[PDB]
Design a protein around this nucleic acid. Sequence first.
RNA 1: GAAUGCCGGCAUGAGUAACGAUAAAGAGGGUGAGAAUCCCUCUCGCCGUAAGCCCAAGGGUUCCUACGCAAUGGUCGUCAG
RNA 2: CGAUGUCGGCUCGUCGCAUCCUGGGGCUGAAGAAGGUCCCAAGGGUUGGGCUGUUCGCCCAUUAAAGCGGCACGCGAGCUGGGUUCAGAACGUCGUGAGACAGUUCGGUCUCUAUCCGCCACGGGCGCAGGAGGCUUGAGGGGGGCUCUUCCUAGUACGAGAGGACCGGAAGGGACGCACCUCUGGUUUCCCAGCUGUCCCUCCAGGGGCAUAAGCUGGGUAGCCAUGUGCGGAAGGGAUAACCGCUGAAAGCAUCUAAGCGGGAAGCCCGCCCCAAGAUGAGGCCUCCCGGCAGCCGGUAAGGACCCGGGAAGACCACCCGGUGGAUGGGCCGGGGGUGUAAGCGCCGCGAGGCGUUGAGCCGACCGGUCCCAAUCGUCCGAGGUCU
Lengths: 122, 131, 204, 59, 118, 63
Amino acid sequence: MIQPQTYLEVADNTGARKIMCIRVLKGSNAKYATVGDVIVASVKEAIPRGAVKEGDVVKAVVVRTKKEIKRPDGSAIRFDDNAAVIINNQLEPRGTRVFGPVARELREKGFMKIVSLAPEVL
Amino acid sequence: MNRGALIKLVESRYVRTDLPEFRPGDTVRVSYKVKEGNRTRIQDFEGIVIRIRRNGFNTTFTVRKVSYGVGVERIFPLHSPLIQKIDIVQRGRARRAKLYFIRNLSDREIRRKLRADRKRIDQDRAAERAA
Amino acid sequence: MKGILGVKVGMTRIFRDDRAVPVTVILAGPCPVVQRRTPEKDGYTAVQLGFLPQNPKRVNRPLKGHFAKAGVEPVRILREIRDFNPEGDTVTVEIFKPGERVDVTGTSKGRGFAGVMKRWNFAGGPDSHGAHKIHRHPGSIGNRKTPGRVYKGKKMAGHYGAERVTVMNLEVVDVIPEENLLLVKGAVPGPNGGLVIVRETKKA
Amino acid sequence: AKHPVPKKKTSKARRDARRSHHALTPPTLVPCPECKAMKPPHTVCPECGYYAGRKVLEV
Amino acid sequence: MRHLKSGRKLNRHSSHRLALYRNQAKSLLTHGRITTTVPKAKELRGFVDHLIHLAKRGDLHARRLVLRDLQDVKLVRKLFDEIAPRYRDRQGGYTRVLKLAERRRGDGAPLALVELVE
Amino acid sequence: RIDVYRTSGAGGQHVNRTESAVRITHIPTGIVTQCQNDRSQHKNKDQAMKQMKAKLYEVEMQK
RNA sequence: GAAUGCCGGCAUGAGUAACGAUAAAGAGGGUGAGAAUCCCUCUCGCCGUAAGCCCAAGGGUUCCUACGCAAUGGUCGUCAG
RNA sequence: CGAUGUCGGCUCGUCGCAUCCUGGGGCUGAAGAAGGUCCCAAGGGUUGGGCUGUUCGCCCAUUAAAGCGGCACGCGAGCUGGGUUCAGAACGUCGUGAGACAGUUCGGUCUCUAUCCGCCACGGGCGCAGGAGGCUUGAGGGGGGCUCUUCCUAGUACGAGAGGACCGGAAGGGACGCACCUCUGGUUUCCCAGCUGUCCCUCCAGGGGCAUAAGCUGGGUAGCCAUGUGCGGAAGGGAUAACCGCUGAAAGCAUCUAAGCGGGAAGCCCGCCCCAAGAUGAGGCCUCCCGGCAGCCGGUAAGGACCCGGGAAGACCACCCGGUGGAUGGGCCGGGGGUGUAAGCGCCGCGAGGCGUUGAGCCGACCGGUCCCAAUCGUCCGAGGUCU
Ligand SMILES: [Mg+2]
Ligand SMILES: [Mg+2]
Ligand SMILES: [Mg+2]
Ligand SMILES: [Mg+2]
Ligand SMILES: [Mg+2]
Ligand SMILES: [Mg+2]
Ligand SMILES: [Mg+2]
Ligand SMILES: [Mg+2]
Ligand SMILES: [Mg+2]
Ligand SMILES: [Mg+2]
Ligand SMILES: [Mg+2]
Ligand SMILES: [Mg+2]
Ligand SMILES: [Mg+2]
Ligand SMILES: [Mg+2]
Ligand SMILES: [Mg+2]
Ligand SMILES: [Mg+2]
Ligand SMILES: [Mg+2]
Ligand SMILES: [Mg+2]
Ligand SMILES: [Mg+2]
Ligand SMILES: [Mg+2]
Ligand SMILES: [Mg+2]
Ligand SMILES: [Mg+2]
Ligand SMILES: [Mg+2]
Ligand SMILES: [Mg+2]
Ligand SMILES: [Mg+2]
Ligand SMILES: [Mg+2]
Ligand SMILES: [Mg+2]
Ligand SMILES: [Mg+2]
Ligand SMILES: [Mg+2]
Ligand SMILES: [Mg+2]
Ligand SMILES: [Mg+2]
Ligand SMILES: [Mg+2]
Ligand SMILES: [Mg+2]
Ligand SMILES: [Mg+2]
Ligand SMILES: [Mg+2]
Ligand SMILES: [Mg+2]
Ligand SMILES: [Mg+2]
Ligand SMILES: [Mg+2]
Ligand SMILES: [Mg+2]
Ligand SMILES: [Mg+2]
Ligand SMILES: [Mg+2]
Ligand SMILES: [Mg+2]
Ligand SMILES: [Mg+2]
Ligand SMILES: [Mg+2]
Ligand SMILES: [Mg+2]
Ligand SMILES: [Mg+2]
Ligand SMILES: [Mg+2]
Ligand SMILES: [Mg+2]
Ligand SMILES: [Mg+2]
Ligand SMILES: [Mg+2]
Ligand SMILES: [Mg+2]
Ligand SMILES: [Mg+2]
Ligand SMILES: [Mg+2]
Ligand SMILES: [Mg+2]
Ligand SMILES: [Mg+2]
Ligand SMILES: [Mg+2]
Ligand SMILES: [Mg+2]
Ligand SMILES: [Mg+2]
Ligand SMILES: [Mg+2]
Ligand SMILES: [Mg+2]
Ligand SMILES: [Mg+2]
Ligand SMILES: [Mg+2]
Ligand SMILES: [Mg+2]
Ligand SMILES: [Mg+2]
Ligand SMILES: [Mg+2]
Ligand SMILES: [Mg+2]
Ligand SMILES: [Mg+2]
Ligand SMILES: [Mg+2]
Ligand SMILES: [Mg+2]
Ligand SMILES: [Mg+2]
Ligand SMILES: [Mg+2]
Ligand SMILES: [Mg+2]
Ligand SMILES: [Mg+2]
Ligand SMILES: [Mg+2]
Ligand SMILES: [Mg+2]
Ligand SMILES: [Mg+2]
Ligand SMILES: [Mg+2]
Ligand SMILES: [Mg+2]
Ligand SMILES: [Mg+2]
Ligand SMILES: [Mg+2]
Ligand SMILES: [Mg+2]
Ligand SMILES: [Mg+2]
Ligand SMILES: [Mg+2]
Ligand SMILES: [Mg+2]
Ligand SMILES: [Mg+2]
Ligand SMILES: [Mg+2]
Ligand SMILES: [Mg+2]
Ligand SMILES: [Mg+2]
Ligand SMILES: [Mg+2]
Ligand SMILES: [Mg+2]
Ligand SMILES: [Mg+2]
Ligand SMILES: [Mg+2]
Ligand SMILES: [Mg+2]
Ligand SMILES: [Mg+2]
Ligand SMILES: [Mg+2]
Ligand SMILES: [Mg+2]
Ligand SMILES: [Mg+2]
Ligand SMILES: [Mg+2]
Ligand SMILES: [Mg+2]
Ligand SMILES: [Mg+2]
Ligand SMILES: [Mg+2]
Ligand SMILES: [Mg+2]
Ligand SMILES: [Mg+2]
Ligand SMILES: [Mg+2]
Ligand SMILES: [Mg+2]
Ligand SMILES: [Mg+2]
Ligand SMILES: [Mg+2]
Ligand SMILES: [Mg+2]
Ligand SMILES: [Mg+2]
Ligand SMILES: [Mg+2]
Ligand SMILES: [Mg+2]
Ligand SMILES: [Mg+2]
Ligand SMILES: [Mg+2]
Ligand SMILES: [Mg+2]
Ligand SMILES: [Mg+2]
Ligand SMILES: [Mg+2]
Ligand SMILES: [Mg+2]
Ligand SMILES: [Mg+2]
Ligand SMILES: [Mg+2]
Ligand SMILES: [Mg+2]
Ligand SMILES: [Mg+2]
Ligand SMILES: [Mg+2]
Ligand SMILES: [Mg+2]
Ligand SMILES: [Mg+2]
Ligand SMILES: [Mg+2]
Ligand SMILES: [Mg+2]
Ligand SMILES: [Mg+2]
Ligand SMILES: [Mg+2]
Ligand SMILES: [Mg+2]
Ligand SMILES: [Mg+2]
Ligand SMILES: [Mg+2]
Ligand SMILES: [Mg+2]
Ligand SMILES: [Mg+2]
Ligand SMILES: [Mg+2]
Ligand SMILES: [Mg+2]
Ligand SMILES: [Mg+2]
Ligand SMILES: [Mg+2]
Ligand SMILES: [Mg+2]
Ligand SMILES: [Mg+2]
Ligand SMILES: [Mg+2]
Ligand SMILES: [Mg+2]
Ligand SMILES: [Mg+2]
Ligand SMILES: [Mg+2]
Ligand SMILES: [Mg+2]
Ligand SMILES: [Mg+2]
Ligand SMILES: [Mg+2]
Ligand SMILES: [Mg+2]
Ligand SMILES: [Mg+2]
Ligand SMILES: [Mg+2]
Ligand SMILES: [Mg+2]
Ligand SMILES: [Mg+2]
Ligand SMILES: [Mg+2]
Ligand SMILES: [Mg+2]
Ligand SMILES: [Mg+2]
Ligand SMILES: [Mg+2]
Ligand SMILES: [Mg+2]
Ligand SMILES: [Mg+2]
Ligand SMILES: [Zn+2]
C-alpha cells in the first residue's frame, strides 16, 4: 500500500537511499501501489556521486511492502520496510544489483532482471 | 440442522493430520510448494512462529525471519495442500500467545526473551525412540 | 429456468488446484413442488416449492388444505421459481453441477436506522478545522428558491438492509448430494440461517 | 441553527387530528383461577398471592 | 446495531453494572428472595446461578472465586454449607423470576421477585 | 485571450459578486498582463490593453 | 378591527424542549390512606489543602421540638431551610 | 431597506449541450499509425498535488479525458469564516486638523428545540361487498449505464523506411456500486493475563475497590467493519440519430425518397437488479369457514389480536420465531474460541524467584445438547354474505 507522500527504501545501488512516491502509475486514479506496480517518485536522500542525485524525479518498481501481500494460495507475505528498485522507461533496473529479498509477485509482472538480481525471491 | 457440523463436514475432506504440533515461540521450517515459470519446486521458509490464529480448519500461523537484513513474515494456512512438510528446528518458551513484540527486539534480546523450552525439547527426544 | 430454495449455513474456503477459494455453504434441498402455475390457469409458468419440514401443530387449516391437495407433508416456506417446470415432484441440489453459474437471492442484513455515511457512503464533514456538530451530516440537500424543494429519491438517512438482494453469476464450486449441500464461490446476502434462493444465472 | 418557529397557529382541527393516536388502551386482564380477581396475565395475583396454581406471596 | 450481542447495559458503566450484580447477589443470597425491576431480575439469574454452581463444587478454589464477587466470608459459609446442598441433584436453574402485578408509583417501573428455588 | 475574474482585496459586496479584474494573455507571444485598479471591468480592460501594447513594444524593441 | 397601540383573559408551538454537573446506586425492615424519593440496617460509589472543621461579612429565627402537607421543593413526599 | 446574509472552500447534488473522453459518421492537403475539421450523440465518466483567502491562473505527476455553463454567478434555519463590511493598532499616501484610501498589514462573538410544504424512512386508520391463511401477476417507478492496458490475429494490409492496422478473439487492471466476514487487517467497556500506588477483607498466602465515563499495559471470540472476499457495467432483441445504401419517378438522363425496402451509436425501447394492486382501474391463483329485533343487538366459525420467552428484525411501531403436544431465552453440559501453565501442595534457592503437579485455571456473544428456571392460567375480537 504505497501512495503519494510514502517514503520507500531503495533496494539498489543507483545511489538513491530514499524516495518519496508522487504518483502511482496504474490508470488515472489508482489509490495505492503494491508490489510489482510502478511509481513516479522524488529522490529525497542519496549518497554522493551516485547515478541519481537528490531532487531527481525517477521511476521505480515496488519490490517490498510493509502492508502484507495476499496470494491466491491463501498465504501472505509482509516485510519490515517499503522498498523499490529504480527503473528506466523500459522497466529495467538502473542499478547493477538489488539488496534484500523481493516479492515473487515481480516475476509474473515482467521484472525478470530485478528478480534474478535479488538475493532471494520470497 | 447443525450448521457447524455441516461446515466441519465440508472441511473434513481438506484436513491435514500429518503436521507436527508447535507453539508461538518455536523455530520452525516450512517446506512450501512454489511455482516458477512452468515448473514447481520446494522452497524452505524457516523462522519463529509468532502467532497461531485458531479457527479449526481455518487455522493459520505466522512465521517471522530476518532475510538478508530485512524482516519478513509469512502467514500460512495450517492445512494448506501447498505445505510439503513442517520441521521443528527448535522449541522456545514464550509467556504469551502473540509474539508481535519481537518485531522491535534485537537478536540478543529475542534470544534472551525466548529461552529454550527444555520440557518440550526433552519430550521431543523421548519420542523419536521407535519400537 | 431451474431454481431451488435453501438456507445459508456458513462460509469457508476449500483448496482447488493449489488455490484457496472462498465459499458459502448452502443447504438447498430437498424441495417438494406443492403447486404448479400454468399459462391456462395462472397466466404464467412457475413452480411453488416447499422447504423445510414443519410441525403440523403450527399449521392452520387453510395451509393444510393447500398441502393436502398436493401429495405433501407440511412445510415452513413456500416459494415460486419463475419459468421452471421440473419433471419430478422434488427438486434437489442434483439440479446443479460443479462449474455452473448461479444467481443467489437473499435478505441482506438489517442495519436499522442508518446514517448518510453508512447508507450512502457520503463523506460527512471534517473532524476539526472548525467543523461544528456536522461530522456525519449530509450537508446541503438542495438549491434555493428555484426549485424550492427537494428531489424525490434524495439520498438521506433511513432504514437500510433487511431487503431483497440478488448477487449474480456465482460459481458452483461443488455440490454434495448426500447432505443436500451446495458450495458457491464467494459471498451470499444475509445471515447464517438466512433463507436464500439459488437459480441458474441470467448472465451469458 | 437559526431558531425555527411555527409559521402559523395550529388550527383546532389540525391539533385534534394530531391527537387521533393518543387514546389509551385499557389494561389487559384475566381472571385469577384461584380467587377469580382480575389481574394482568403472567403476573402473580396480588389479591391471593397464587401463581401457577401454587402459593407464592403472603397477602 | 446490537446483532447477537449478549448482556444488558442497564444504563450503568462497566464497574457500576458489576457492583449492581454483586450487591443484588449478596442481597438474594442473604434473604433468599428479593424484589427488583423485571430486567434487573432477569439479568441476575445467570450471575447468581454461577455462584451457586461453584458452591456446589465446594473446593477451596471455588470458594475463592465466589469470594471475588461476594466478599463476605460468613455469607459464603452460608452459600457452601446451607444453600449449596439443596441443589446437589439439581442441574442449573437455581433461581426463579416471577413478575409482580403492580408497578412502582413514582416511576411506573414493573417489578419482579427473584428467589432461590426450593 | 482575455480572462476575467473578481478583483482582490477591499471593495465590499460590489467586489465579491463582480468580475472587475481582467487579464489579457497573448497566445503566440506568451506575455500575460492584468489590471484591477478601477471598479469597472472595462476601465481595467482599457488599462490591460494599454499595458499589453507596452509589453509587445518592449519585446519587439528587444529583438 | 388594525396604531410591532394600552390592561386583562385564554389559546398555538405541545404532552413537545427541559427537570440545572456522568460522584452511582442495590436490597431488607419500619412508618403511612398513599413510599425509587421519609426513618433504620447492610452492601456499593464520591470528596478528603475538602465536597471536612473553626472565624469574620452578610442574612435575620432559617436553630430545637411537637403537630401538619394547600402552596414553595423543577418528580414524589409521610420529608424539609 | 418594520432585513432577500454578501466571496472562496466543504458537503450534497441536479440540469443544459455550444461534447473534454468514450460510441457512430462525412470531408481531408485521410498510405499506415496518428491528427485536423464538421455532423450525430448528455448514458456514464471527467485524478492527485505545489502556490495564493482566492474564483481565475501558473506549475508538478499522471490520464481515455482532466469540458463549458444553469440552478439567488445552487447550496451559511447544512458546516467553514481564510477574503470582504464595525469597534483596536501600524505602514505608505492625502489632509493645518479631526480623520481618510477598490492601498496594504496583525487581530476581531456566525443564534440548542422545524408549525406547514418538500424529502428520507416507519406505522395507525379505512377502503378493495362475505370473512380468513398463503402464493403471486406487474400497470407504473427507481437503480444501474465508465474505461484502460497487454497478448493472438500480425510484425500481416499499408509503407522507401521509421512506423503500423481495420474486423474478429483472449487476458489483466483503475475508479465506482451491491453484498459478505472464509482469508488478510481493525474494534472488541471487563474474555484472559501482567504491573504500579493506595485503602480494605484476614497476619501470611490469596483476593476486592479506586486511579476514566476500562487505572495502565499485552492480547482477544462473536458481532459490527475495509484495507479484505465475491459479484455487477453486459450479452442479446427492437426502433432510430448523423451517415451509407437498394429499387425509383416527377424531369426520356439523373436522384437514398416523392411510393416502398435495407444498414446504422456508450444514446432510445426492452432485457438485468429493486419497489410496486390506495393500479379506488384496489388484479389473479390455491386453500379454509357457514340466534333477538341494504339497519341494528348478541353469541360463535375459519382465523386473528391481546399477554408472555425472544430474534444478525428493530428508535416506538412494524416484521419474524416460539409459548409446556416447547429447546424461545437464562442456567447447566459438550465443543469451538480467547488467554496462556490458576489456587493448593511438594522440591530447589539465604532471597527476589524457579521447577513440577499443568496447555493448567479462568472463560461474553459462536456451534449444539439438556425441561433445571422462566414462556402459568387465560381473555377479547372476529362470517350469517347489497342490488339488477
Ligand atoms: Mg513507513
Ligand atoms: Mg537536497
Ligand atoms: Mg538541493
Ligand atoms: Mg536493505
Ligand atoms: Mg461457523
Ligand atoms: Mg527438537
Ligand atoms: Mg529460541
Ligand atoms: Mg532472529
Ligand atoms: Mg473440488
Ligand atoms: Mg439490525
Ligand atoms: Mg452519517
Ligand atoms: Mg452502503
Ligand atoms: Mg461507508
Ligand atoms: Mg456499501
Ligand atoms: Mg456519490
Ligand atoms: Mg473530503
Ligand atoms: Mg475535510
Ligand atoms: Mg471523515
Ligand atoms: Mg468557530
Ligand atoms: Mg465536535
Ligand atoms: Mg417550486
Ligand atoms: Mg425494514
Ligand atoms: Mg466472472
Ligand atoms: Mg451552534
Ligand atoms: Mg436540526
Ligand atoms: Mg406568519
Ligand atoms: Mg403552530
Ligand atoms: Mg374536535
Ligand atoms: Mg377536541
Ligand atoms: Mg442500528
Ligand atoms: Mg440492533
Ligand atoms: Mg453504536
Ligand atoms: Mg443470545
Ligand atoms: Mg434488553
Ligand atoms: Mg448507558
Ligand atoms: Mg436515563
Ligand atoms: Mg471504572
Ligand atoms: Mg469471575
Ligand atoms: Mg406488567
Ligand atoms: Mg472602503
Ligand atoms: Mg456587481
Ligand atoms: Mg385591540
Ligand atoms: Mg380601521
Ligand atoms: Mg390590537
Ligand atoms: Mg399587556
Ligand atoms: Mg402560553
Ligand atoms: Mg399549548
Ligand atoms: Mg409521547
Ligand atoms: Mg415539535
Ligand atoms: Mg423529540
Ligand atoms: Mg421525550
Ligand atoms: Mg434531558
Ligand atoms: Mg427529553
Ligand atoms: Mg436539579
Ligand atoms: Mg441529571
Ligand atoms: Mg443513574
Ligand atoms: Mg417495606
Ligand atoms: Mg404499616
Ligand atoms: Mg425501600
Ligand atoms: Mg475516592
Ligand atoms: Mg490528604
Ligand atoms: Mg453576624
Ligand atoms: Mg433572602
Ligand atoms: Mg424554626
Ligand atoms: Mg415529626
Ligand atoms: Mg406540600
Ligand atoms: Mg400534598
Ligand atoms: Mg410537588
Ligand atoms: Mg428549581
Ligand atoms: Mg403520614
Ligand atoms: Mg432544621
Ligand atoms: Mg433592503
Ligand atoms: Mg417581513
Ligand atoms: Mg457528492
Ligand atoms: Mg450538439
Ligand atoms: Mg468517436
Ligand atoms: Mg473524423
Ligand atoms: Mg486513420
Ligand atoms: Mg460535418
Ligand atoms: Mg454524456
Ligand atoms: Mg444527464
Ligand atoms: Mg457530463
Ligand atoms: Mg486538479
Ligand atoms: Mg491548496
Ligand atoms: Mg488556486
Ligand atoms: Mg497556503
Ligand atoms: Mg490569479
Ligand atoms: Mg507534467
Ligand atoms: Mg451564491
Ligand atoms: Mg452575476
Ligand atoms: Mg446569474
Ligand atoms: Mg458559502
Ligand atoms: Mg440557506
Ligand atoms: Mg432560509
Ligand atoms: Mg477567526
Ligand atoms: Mg479575518
Ligand atoms: Mg488576514
Ligand atoms: Mg455598529
Ligand atoms: Mg502631513
Ligand atoms: Mg489637532
Ligand atoms: Mg469615506
Ligand atoms: Mg479601508
Ligand atoms: Mg490571537
Ligand atoms: Mg483585517
Ligand atoms: Mg453561519
Ligand atoms: Mg410535526
Ligand atoms: Mg406551507
Ligand atoms: Mg398501511
Ligand atoms: Mg365504500
Ligand atoms: Mg415496467
Ligand atoms: Mg404513481
Ligand atoms: Mg428503466
Ligand atoms: Mg507472433
Ligand atoms: Mg503466423
Ligand atoms: Mg474488435
Ligand atoms: Mg479488438
Ligand atoms: Mg473489466
Ligand atoms: Mg472496491
Ligand atoms: Mg469469524
Ligand atoms: Mg476477522
Ligand atoms: Mg484479524
Ligand atoms: Mg472479534
Ligand atoms: Mg470479569
Ligand atoms: Mg480491573
Ligand atoms: Mg465474568
Ligand atoms: Mg515503588
Ligand atoms: Mg490493589
Ligand atoms: Mg477488620
Ligand atoms: Mg498479601
Ligand atoms: Mg473506596
Ligand atoms: Mg471515578
Ligand atoms: Mg489517563
Ligand atoms: Mg486493551
Ligand atoms: Mg487486535
Ligand atoms: Mg476496499
Ligand atoms: Mg471487475
Ligand atoms: Mg417514403
Ligand atoms: Mg437494425
Ligand atoms: Mg445498443
Ligand atoms: Mg460499455
Ligand atoms: Mg404484490
Ligand atoms: Mg416483490
Ligand atoms: Mg389489492
Ligand atoms: Mg386482492
Ligand atoms: Mg423485543
Ligand atoms: Mg404467534
Ligand atoms: Mg397459551
Ligand atoms: Mg418433549
Ligand atoms: Mg435454553
Ligand atoms: Mg440452551
Ligand atoms: Mg483452545
Ligand atoms: Mg506452574
Ligand atoms: Mg499453580
Ligand atoms: Mg526453601
Ligand atoms: Mg468452555
Ligand atoms: Mg427432550
Ligand atoms: Mg386466567
Ligand atoms: Zn388470586
